[model samples]
Target: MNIFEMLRIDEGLRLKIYKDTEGYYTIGIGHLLTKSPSLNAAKSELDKAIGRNCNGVITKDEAEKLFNQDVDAAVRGILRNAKLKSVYDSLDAVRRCALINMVFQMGETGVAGFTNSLRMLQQKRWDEAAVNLAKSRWYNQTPNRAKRVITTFRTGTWDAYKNL
Candidate 1:
């Protein structure tokens, strides 16, 4: 493999700048602190090239290019912590991605406490891990999204929110 093919293994490749875990505007590969425009502001902001409104989307080419700019550093940041780094090397892609998604939602320190869930996941007990996750506040805060994430991690096929 070329050294760079592995660069974006965990990017999540967002097509738009969306509100992040704490409601800050974030875009490709977890770019953060940009502004989210209301419909009224979209056209004005569109000319800046800084990013887009939450409801707007760019092409895959745009996302790919944007992520490419930071893939190495972003991946490194996720692995810089002891708690996440400790078990990272042992995970397969699906399991690793679950952790990546989790870090985005909870931040490394917040998720480091989910040792039981991580253990079950390391064992590939997907449903059990989902149940374990459900036993926490994250499930309560966003039930529908949690169910979809749990199902996606558990089954490898996404159970999407069809209504968006």
Candidate 2:
């Protein structure tokens, strides 16, 4: 499956603003409105997407566009990250998606903090990489999602999230 479908399931669609697990102001498939460059910029974009003044709500189509932008940024983040680029290039699409998924959830710097895990992945030490991932606070905070990601790392397959 593509990153979009995987993320659609991972980050459930939301039409209204809400706080994420880390308490960031989020909307529409985990878009962090609080983290946007500026509230006014974000508001303008939201209005443009929905073709009206936003009233603390978004349409599915608008959400989809935001999702696309976020995913594209995640992919670009991985590609531009010096620590990740080589390993990312060595991986298959499924494994690549796993990294992108992690980047999507945690941001590029967060994923890059897994130095040993990334080295293991670079070495194709799947089991070791999975083990490293399991040791993170991220795994503790979101066990189910982390487990699926770990399984994907271990198996290099989409089976962990195939049902999505």
Q: Largest lDDT belongs to which candidate?
A: 2
lDDT of 1 by residue, 22-109 (tens): 4656555555534454533543443344464434566776666655555444356568977667666666664565566666555677
**CA-lDDT, candidates in order:** 0.59, 0.84
Which portions of model 2 show Cα errors greater than 4 Å? Answer: 35-52
What is the lDDT, from 0 to 100, of the residue 140 in candidate 1? Answer: 85
Name the regions of candidate 1 deviating beyond 4 angstroms.
1-31, 34-74, 157-164
lDDT of 2 by residue, 1-164 (tens): 77888787788888987668876667899887765545566666567656788977888888888888899999999989999898899888889988998999999999999999999999999988888889989999989888888888899788978765
What lDDT does candidate 2 reach at residue 34?
Answer: 65
Q: What is the alpha-carbon lDDT for the whole of candidate 1?
A: 0.59
RMSD of each: 7.0, 2.9
Quote the positional error of residue 158 for candidate 1 in Å. 4.6
> TM-score for every candidate vs. truth?
0.54, 0.88
